[PDB]
């Protein structure tokens, strides 16, 4: 089986700036006239769409900027003004001998100016403490980079238990994170207590940013 | 045009056979390969059938497991995986002639698990309290254990969009999934604009309108 070897495995990159990712196969994959090596982009949630077959070859719809290069063994494809809606995964595939064969992949991520996340919090609804269950949720939306930590505090003390994190991805248009925590006590413990606050720890600030409420 | 089967839920062990109907050229004529995707994860070759003959030729990974078949009568292939497992969840693709291009069916989801269906509990989110005066309030609802995805949500019966996220589900150690779906709002309008989230789960035909109100303290 021909191995194809993608690297690098993630780029991050500012709009506007170029970049080039390398695929090699374990041999030549020249023949006829032609080098049976295409590139394709899988954006979250979609299926792969051709931009090059060939090794240079440019789908029709496909804009100039991506341009794909090399034969034998060494290809690249190259993405001039880079933008967020970029933002996907690349595979090159060999199509000489079978079985066909992707590339692990090239998850191009893009760079921009740091935000702040915007927290809200929300209490338990009504109709969760009808039954036996109060969560607690907070959404720390539109932010960068994508590290980010978020704490949650019971009457002044953390509660690291029965806690559930999500993060959206890159956004398509700004590039941003999102990301929602959700703490899940009994009825009971929420009862109990009175202070709940997430505090969100991410580089744009010195100091957690900090939401809060009192039952 | 390539127009897959709907989507497939299954019990680990038990099989799943995926419909491919083609039109808009000759079908015995090009090899018709299927490629999976995972959710969040790459594309993945499986096989191909030439539709002429019916010879084929699977990846390592699923020979003796999955089984290409063609009905040249009505242009329509097929694959068949046994022996499913939660790790065949994805979405699955024909594509034609994938080595020289081209054509993919808009793929069919399946979904491998010892969970049943399941329609989501709807909880709100309350209006985020806030200590000082004015500023930007989020709201939700929390769409929490269904069974299987997917879940579509809009607000006010699609008439607020501005502001709106509803994030991907995750799956929970329960074997089902819950999501949220978000809106940032002004403050100054929680007093007089009312919100529903609209949550519809087709795969067990539950439909739920939440409104979405300020706590009583507020």
């Known amino acids: 089986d021909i191995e194809l070897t993608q690297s690098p495995a993630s780029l991050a990159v500012s709009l506007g700036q170029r970049a080039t990712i390398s695929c090699k196969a374990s041999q030549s994959v020249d023949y006829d006239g032609d080098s049976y090596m295409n590139w394709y982009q899988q954006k979250p949630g979609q299926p792969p769409k051709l931009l090059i077959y060939a090794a240079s070859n440019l789908e029709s719809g496909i804009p100039v900027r991506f341009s794909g290069s090399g034969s034998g063994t060494d290809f690249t494809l190259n993405i001039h003004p880079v933008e967020e809606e970029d933002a996907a995964t690349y595979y090159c595939?060999?199509?000489?001998?079978?079985?066909?064969?992707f590339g692990s992949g090239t998850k191009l991520e893009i760079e921009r100016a740091d935000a702040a996340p915007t927290v809200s919090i929300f209490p338990p609804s009504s109709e969760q403490l009808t039954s036996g269950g109060a969560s607690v949720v907070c959404f720390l939306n539109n932010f960068y980079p994508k590290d980010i930590n978020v704490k949650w505090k019971i009457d002044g003390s953390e509660r690291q238990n029965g806690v559930l994190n999500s993060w959206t991805d890159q956004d398509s248009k700004d590039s941003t994170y999102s990301m929602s925590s959700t703490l899940t006590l009994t009825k009971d413990e929420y009862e109990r207590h009175n202070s709940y606050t997430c505090e969100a720890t991410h580089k744009t600030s010195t100091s957690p940013i900090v939401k809060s409420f009192n039952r | 045009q390539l127009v897959q089967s709907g989507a497939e839920v299954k019990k680990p062990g038990a099989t799943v056979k995926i419909s491919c109907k083609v039109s808009?050229?000759?079908?015995?004529?090009?090899?018709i390969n299927w490629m999976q995707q995972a959710p969040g994860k790459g594309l993945e070759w499986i096989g191909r059938?030439?539709?002429?003959?019916?010879?084929?030729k699977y990846n390592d990974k699923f020979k003796g497991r999955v089984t290409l078949t063609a009905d040249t009568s009505t242009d329509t292939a097929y694959m068949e995986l046994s022996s499913l497992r939660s790790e065949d969840t994805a979405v699955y693709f024909c594509?034609?002639?994938?080595?020289?291009?081209?054509?993919w069916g808009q793929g069919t989801m399946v979904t491998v698990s010892s969970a049943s269906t399941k329609g989501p509990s709807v909880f709100p989110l309350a209006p985020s309290s806030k200590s000082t005066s004015g500023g930007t309030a989020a709201l939700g609802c929390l769409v929490k254990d269904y069974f299987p995805e997917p879940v579509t949500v809009s607000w006010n019966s699609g008439a607020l969009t501005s502001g709106v996220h509803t994030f991907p589900a995750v799956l929970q150690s329960s074997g089902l999934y819950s999501l949220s779906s978000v809106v940032t709002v002004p403050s100054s309008s929680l007093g007089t604009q009312t919100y529903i989230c609209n949550v519809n789960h087709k795969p067990s035909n539950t439909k739920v309108d939440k409104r979405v109100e300020p706590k009583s303290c507020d």
């Open positions: 594509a034609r002639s994938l080595t020289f291009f081209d054509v």
């Open positions: 808009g050229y000759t079908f015995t004529d090009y090899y």
């Open positions: 059938i030439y539709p002429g003959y019916g010879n084929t």
């Open positions: 595939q060999q199509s000489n001998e079978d079985p066909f064969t």
